Tab-separated table of N, CA and C in Angstrom:
chain	number	residue	atom	x	y	z
A	58	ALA	N	47.317	23.523	101.368
A	58	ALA	CA	48.162	22.415	100.941
A	58	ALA	C	49.225	22.890	99.960
A	59	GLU	N	48.844	23.760	99.023
A	59	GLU	CA	49.806	24.282	98.060
A	59	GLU	C	50.872	25.120	98.749
A	60	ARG	N	50.480	25.933	99.732
A	60	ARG	CA	51.462	26.745	100.445
A	60	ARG	C	52.431	25.873	101.233
A	61	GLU	N	51.918	24.840	101.905
A	61	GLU	CA	52.800	23.936	102.635
A	61	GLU	C	53.746	23.215	101.686
A	62	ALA	N	53.236	22.777	100.533
A	62	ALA	CA	54.097	22.153	99.538
A	62	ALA	C	55.154	23.131	99.046
A	63	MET	N	54.772	24.391	98.841
A	63	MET	CA	55.733	25.401	98.416
A	63	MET	C	56.842	25.558	99.446
A	64	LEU	N	56.476	25.646	100.726
A	64	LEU	CA	57.487	25.812	101.768
A	64	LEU	C	58.415	24.605	101.831
A	65	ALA	N	57.840	23.399	101.830
A	65	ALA	CA	58.661	22.198	101.918
A	65	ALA	C	59.583	22.074	100.712
A	66	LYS	N	59.059	22.327	99.511
A	66	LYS	CA	59.879	22.232	98.312
A	66	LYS	C	60.933	23.325	98.263
A	67	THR	N	60.639	24.513	98.791
A	67	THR	CA	61.651	25.561	98.836
A	67	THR	C	62.787	25.184	99.776
A	68	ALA	N	62.459	24.635	100.948
A	68	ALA	CA	63.512	24.166	101.845
A	68	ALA	C	64.318	23.048	101.196
A	69	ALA	N	63.629	22.100	100.558
A	69	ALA	CA	64.317	21.005	99.888
A	69	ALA	C	65.193	21.520	98.757
A	70	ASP	N	64.757	22.580	98.074
A	70	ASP	CA	65.537	23.123	96.969
A	70	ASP	C	66.740	23.911	97.461
A	71	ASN	N	66.626	24.594	98.601
A	71	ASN	CA	67.812	25.205	99.196
A	71	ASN	C	68.828	24.137	99.585
A	72	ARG	N	68.357	23.075	100.242
A	72	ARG	CA	69.254	21.975	100.582
A	72	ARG	C	69.860	21.363	99.327
A	73	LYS	N	69.056	21.214	98.273
A	73	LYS	CA	69.536	20.615	97.036
A	73	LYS	C	70.545	21.516	96.341
A	74	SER	N	70.344	22.831	96.393
A	74	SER	CA	71.325	23.748	95.830
A	74	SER	C	72.654	23.620	96.558
A	75	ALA	N	72.608	23.584	97.892
A	75	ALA	CA	73.841	23.412	98.655
A	75	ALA	C	74.517	22.091	98.303
A	76	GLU	N	73.740	21.009	98.273
A	76	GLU	CA	74.303	19.696	97.986
A	76	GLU	C	74.851	19.633	96.567
A	77	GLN	N	74.196	20.315	95.629
A	77	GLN	CA	74.618	20.270	94.239
A	77	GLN	C	75.897	21.064	94.030
A	78	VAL	N	76.025	22.235	94.659
A	78	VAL	CA	77.291	22.955	94.568
A	78	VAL	C	78.396	22.149	95.236
A	79	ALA	N	78.091	21.532	96.385
A	79	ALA	CA	79.079	20.706	97.070
A	79	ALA	C	79.571	19.585	96.168
A	80	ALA	N	78.642	18.823	95.587
A	80	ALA	CA	79.022	17.788	94.637
A	80	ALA	C	79.748	18.382	93.442
A	81	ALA	N	79.450	19.636	93.098
A	81	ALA	CA	80.146	20.273	91.990
A	81	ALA	C	81.637	20.365	92.271
A	82	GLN	N	82.015	20.954	93.415
A	82	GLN	CA	83.458	21.070	93.636
A	82	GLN	C	84.049	19.711	93.981
A	83	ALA	N	83.249	18.812	94.557
A	83	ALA	CA	83.740	17.466	94.826
A	83	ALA	C	84.151	16.771	93.536
A	84	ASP	N	83.274	16.787	92.531
A	84	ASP	CA	83.592	16.163	91.252
A	84	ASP	C	84.712	16.909	90.540
A	85	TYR	N	84.738	18.239	90.652
A	85	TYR	CA	85.828	19.003	90.056
A	85	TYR	C	87.172	18.567	90.626
A	86	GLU	N	87.269	18.494	91.954
A	86	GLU	CA	88.510	18.064	92.588
A	86	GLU	C	88.836	16.620	92.233
A	87	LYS	N	87.824	15.752	92.205
A	87	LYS	CA	88.061	14.348	91.887
A	87	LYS	C	88.639	14.195	90.486
A	88	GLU	N	88.039	14.868	89.502
A	88	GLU	CA	88.525	14.733	88.135
A	88	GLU	C	89.868	15.428	87.952
A	89	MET	N	90.111	16.533	88.662
A	89	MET	CA	91.423	17.164	88.588
A	89	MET	C	92.498	16.239	89.142
A	90	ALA	N	92.212	15.582	90.268
A	90	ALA	CA	93.152	14.617	90.824
A	90	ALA	C	93.360	13.449	89.873
A	91	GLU	N	92.284	12.980	89.236
A	91	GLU	CA	92.416	11.903	88.261
A	91	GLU	C	93.316	12.317	87.103
A	92	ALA	N	93.125	13.532	86.587
A	92	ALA	CA	93.948	14.003	85.479
A	92	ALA	C	95.405	14.144	85.895
A	93	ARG	N	95.652	14.684	87.091
A	93	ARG	CA	97.027	14.822	87.561
A	93	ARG	C	97.679	13.458	87.754
A	94	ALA	N	96.930	12.492	88.288
A	94	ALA	CA	97.465	11.144	88.450
A	94	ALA	C	97.759	10.506	87.101
A	95	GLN	N	96.888	10.725	86.114
A	95	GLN	CA	97.139	10.184	84.783
A	95	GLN	C	98.379	10.815	84.163
A	96	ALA	N	98.565	12.121	84.361
A	96	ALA	CA	99.777	12.778	83.881
A	96	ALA	C	101.015	12.208	84.561
A	97	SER	N	100.933	11.980	85.873
A	97	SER	CA	102.051	11.377	86.587
A	97	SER	C	102.352	9.985	86.048
A	98	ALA	N	101.310	9.207	85.753
A	98	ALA	CA	101.513	7.883	85.173
A	98	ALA	C	102.176	7.981	83.806
A	99	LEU	N	101.741	8.938	82.984
A	99	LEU	CA	102.395	9.171	81.699
A	99	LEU	C	103.883	9.429	81.890
A	100	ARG	N	104.220	10.361	82.782
A	100	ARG	CA	105.623	10.695	83.002
A	100	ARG	C	106.402	9.487	83.506
A	101	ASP	N	105.826	8.741	84.451
A	101	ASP	CA	106.531	7.604	85.030
A	101	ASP	C	106.768	6.510	83.999
A	102	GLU	N	105.762	6.200	83.180
A	102	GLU	CA	105.950	5.160	82.174
A	102	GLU	C	106.942	5.605	81.110
A	103	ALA	N	106.900	6.881	80.716
A	103	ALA	CA	107.889	7.376	79.765
A	103	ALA	C	109.295	7.269	80.340
A	104	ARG	N	109.463	7.640	81.611
A	104	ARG	CA	110.776	7.554	82.238
A	104	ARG	C	111.249	6.110	82.331
A	105	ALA	N	110.348	5.190	82.683
A	105	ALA	CA	110.725	3.784	82.771
A	105	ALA	C	111.114	3.230	81.406
A	106	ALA	N	110.356	3.578	80.365
A	106	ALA	CA	110.698	3.122	79.023
A	106	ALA	C	112.049	3.673	78.589
A	107	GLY	N	112.304	4.953	78.863
A	107	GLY	CA	113.601	5.519	78.535
A	107	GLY	C	114.730	4.855	79.297
A	108	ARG	N	114.498	4.546	80.575
A	108	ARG	CA	115.507	3.857	81.369
A	108	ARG	C	115.808	2.482	80.789
A	109	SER	N	114.767	1.737	80.416
A	109	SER	CA	114.984	0.431	79.805
A	109	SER	C	115.750	0.561	78.496
A	110	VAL	N	115.389	1.549	77.676
A	110	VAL	CA	116.051	1.727	76.386
A	110	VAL	C	117.528	2.040	76.588
A	111	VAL	N	117.833	2.963	77.504
A	111	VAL	CA	119.225	3.344	77.718
A	111	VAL	C	120.011	2.182	78.310
A	112	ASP	N	119.402	1.426	79.228
A	112	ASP	CA	120.093	0.279	79.806
A	112	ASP	C	120.414	-0.756	78.736
A	113	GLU	N	119.443	-1.058	77.873
A	113	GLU	CA	119.687	-2.020	76.804
A	113	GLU	C	120.759	-1.516	75.848
A	114	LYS	N	120.701	-0.233	75.486
A	114	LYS	CA	121.681	0.316	74.559
A	114	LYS	C	123.085	0.262	75.146
B	51	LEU	N	68.650	27.749	92.786
B	51	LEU	CA	68.803	26.399	92.249
B	51	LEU	C	69.152	26.435	90.767
B	52	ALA	N	68.483	27.297	89.999
B	52	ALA	CA	68.823	27.423	88.585
B	52	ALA	C	70.262	27.892	88.410
B	53	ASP	N	70.673	28.893	89.193
B	53	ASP	CA	72.045	29.381	89.124
B	53	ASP	C	73.031	28.294	89.530
B	54	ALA	N	72.679	27.491	90.534
B	54	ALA	CA	73.558	26.416	90.972
B	54	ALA	C	73.718	25.364	89.887
B	55	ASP	N	72.632	25.019	89.196
B	55	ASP	CA	72.741	24.068	88.093
B	55	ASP	C	73.589	24.638	86.961
B	56	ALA	N	73.387	25.915	86.629
B	56	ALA	CA	74.194	26.535	85.582
B	56	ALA	C	75.667	26.568	85.972
B	57	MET	N	75.956	26.886	87.235
B	57	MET	CA	77.334	26.900	87.708
B	57	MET	C	77.920	25.497	87.718
B	58	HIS	N	77.110	24.495	88.057
B	58	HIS	CA	77.556	23.111	87.961
B	58	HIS	C	77.986	22.786	86.539
B	59	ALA	N	77.150	23.138	85.561
B	59	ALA	CA	77.486	22.860	84.168
B	59	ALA	C	78.750	23.604	83.748
B	60	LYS	N	78.845	24.887	84.104
B	60	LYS	CA	80.000	25.685	83.705
B	60	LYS	C	81.281	25.159	84.342
B	61	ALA	N	81.226	24.819	85.631
B	61	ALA	CA	82.393	24.280	86.313
B	61	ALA	C	82.787	22.930	85.736
B	62	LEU	N	81.807	22.094	85.388
B	62	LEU	CA	82.121	20.810	84.771
B	62	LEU	C	82.797	21.003	83.419
B	63	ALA	N	82.312	21.963	82.628
B	63	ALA	CA	82.934	22.245	81.337
B	63	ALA	C	84.368	22.724	81.516
B	64	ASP	N	84.575	23.689	82.415
B	64	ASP	CA	85.928	24.166	82.679
B	64	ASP	C	86.807	23.052	83.225
B	65	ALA	N	86.227	22.137	84.000
B	65	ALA	CA	86.989	21.034	84.569
B	65	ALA	C	87.466	20.082	83.484
B	66	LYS	N	86.577	19.712	82.559
B	66	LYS	CA	87.000	18.843	81.466
B	66	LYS	C	88.026	19.544	80.586
B	67	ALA	N	87.847	20.847	80.353
B	67	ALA	CA	88.833	21.589	79.575
B	67	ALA	C	90.195	21.573	80.259
B	68	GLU	N	90.218	21.801	81.575
B	68	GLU	CA	91.475	21.772	82.314
B	68	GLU	C	92.096	20.384	82.283
B	69	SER	N	91.273	19.341	82.405
B	69	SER	CA	91.794	17.980	82.355
B	69	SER	C	92.442	17.695	81.007
B	70	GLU	N	91.782	18.091	79.917
B	70	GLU	CA	92.369	17.897	78.596
B	70	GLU	C	93.660	18.692	78.447
B	71	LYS	N	93.673	19.934	78.936
B	71	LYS	CA	94.869	20.762	78.820
B	71	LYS	C	96.039	20.156	79.586
B	72	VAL	N	95.795	19.692	80.813
B	72	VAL	CA	96.871	19.102	81.601
B	72	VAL	C	97.316	17.782	80.987
B	73	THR	N	96.383	17.020	80.411
B	73	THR	CA	96.773	15.799	79.715
B	73	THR	C	97.694	16.114	78.543
B	74	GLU	N	97.365	17.149	77.768
B	74	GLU	CA	98.220	17.534	76.649
B	74	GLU	C	99.586	18.001	77.137
B	75	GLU	N	99.610	18.794	78.210
B	75	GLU	CA	100.882	19.251	78.761
B	75	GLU	C	101.721	18.073	79.236
B	76	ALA	N	101.085	17.094	79.881
B	76	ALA	CA	101.802	15.906	80.327
B	76	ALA	C	102.328	15.108	79.143
B	77	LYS	N	101.551	15.034	78.061
B	77	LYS	CA	102.030	14.350	76.865
B	77	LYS	C	103.264	15.040	76.299
B	78	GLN	N	103.244	16.373	76.241
B	78	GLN	CA	104.419	17.102	75.769
B	78	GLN	C	105.612	16.864	76.686
B	79	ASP	N	105.378	16.864	78.000
B	79	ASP	CA	106.459	16.614	78.947
B	79	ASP	C	107.040	15.220	78.756
B	80	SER	N	106.178	14.223	78.550
B	80	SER	CA	106.652	12.862	78.329
B	80	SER	C	107.444	12.761	77.033
B	81	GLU	N	106.991	13.445	75.981
B	81	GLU	CA	107.747	13.457	74.732
B	81	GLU	C	109.133	14.050	74.943
B	82	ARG	N	109.207	15.180	75.649
B	82	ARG	CA	110.503	15.799	75.904
B	82	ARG	C	111.396	14.883	76.733
B	83	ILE	N	110.827	14.244	77.756
B	83	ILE	CA	111.611	13.357	78.609
B	83	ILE	C	112.140	12.179	77.805
B	84	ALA	N	111.295	11.584	76.961
B	84	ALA	CA	111.744	10.468	76.138
B	84	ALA	C	112.841	10.902	75.178
B	85	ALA	N	112.682	12.071	74.553
B	85	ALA	CA	113.692	12.547	73.616
B	85	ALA	C	115.030	12.756	74.313
B	86	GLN	N	115.017	13.425	75.469
B	86	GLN	CA	116.275	13.688	76.157
B	86	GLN	C	116.880	12.408	76.719
B	87	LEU	N	116.049	11.454	77.146
B	87	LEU	CA	116.575	10.171	77.595
B	87	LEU	C	117.247	9.425	76.450
B	88	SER	N	116.635	9.437	75.265
B	88	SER	CA	117.256	8.789	74.115
B	88	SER	C	118.570	9.469	73.748
B	89	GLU	N	118.600	10.802	73.793
B	89	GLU	CA	119.839	11.517	73.500
B	89	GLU	C	120.923	11.170	74.513
B	90	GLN	N	120.559	11.099	75.794
B	90	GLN	CA	121.522	10.722	76.822
B	90	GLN	C	122.017	9.295	76.612
B	91	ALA	N	121.126	8.393	76.202
B	91	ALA	CA	121.540	7.024	75.916
B	91	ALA	C	122.534	6.985	74.764
B	92	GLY	N	122.280	7.764	73.712
B	92	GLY	CA	123.233	7.835	72.617
B	92	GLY	C	124.578	8.382	73.058
B	93	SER	N	124.560	9.416	73.903
B	93	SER	CA	125.809	9.963	74.424
B	93	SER	C	126.565	8.918	75.235
B	94	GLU	N	125.849	8.157	76.065
B	94	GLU	CA	126.493	7.100	76.837
B	94	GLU	C	127.091	6.041	75.920
B	95	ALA	N	126.364	5.663	74.869
B	95	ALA	CA	126.865	4.646	73.950
B	95	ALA	C	128.139	5.115	73.259
B	96	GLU	N	128.151	6.358	72.775
B	96	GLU	CA	129.360	6.855	72.120
B	96	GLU	C	130.505	7.015	73.113
B	97	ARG	N	130.203	7.357	74.368
B	97	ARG	CA	131.249	7.399	75.384
B	97	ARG	C	131.845	6.016	75.609
B	98	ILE	N	131.002	4.982	75.612
B	98	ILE	CA	131.505	3.617	75.750
B	98	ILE	C	132.363	3.246	74.547
B	99	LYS	N	131.955	3.675	73.352
B	99	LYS	CA	132.771	3.438	72.162
B	99	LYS	C	134.148	4.075	72.313
């Protein structure tokens, strides 16, 4: 029983290692995209505020 | 599995560091854009004068 449990858990742990690395780069890409989008929003809002200021002036 | 968990932690740390760095760079870019836009607005105003 212990040997069978060892084999099953080893297979599950190989699958879990693969899934965990996969989720690793998935979350890395997701947060990088989030940061880039936030930077783009910063730039866009700054540009819009400057446009409004110059138009009013 | 242990190495994968350690790499997950290390990649997450580097990811948050990169996110903070790019956020700071974007803040600097926005500051520069706002400054140059204000300067251009002043130039336009004096040209109208």
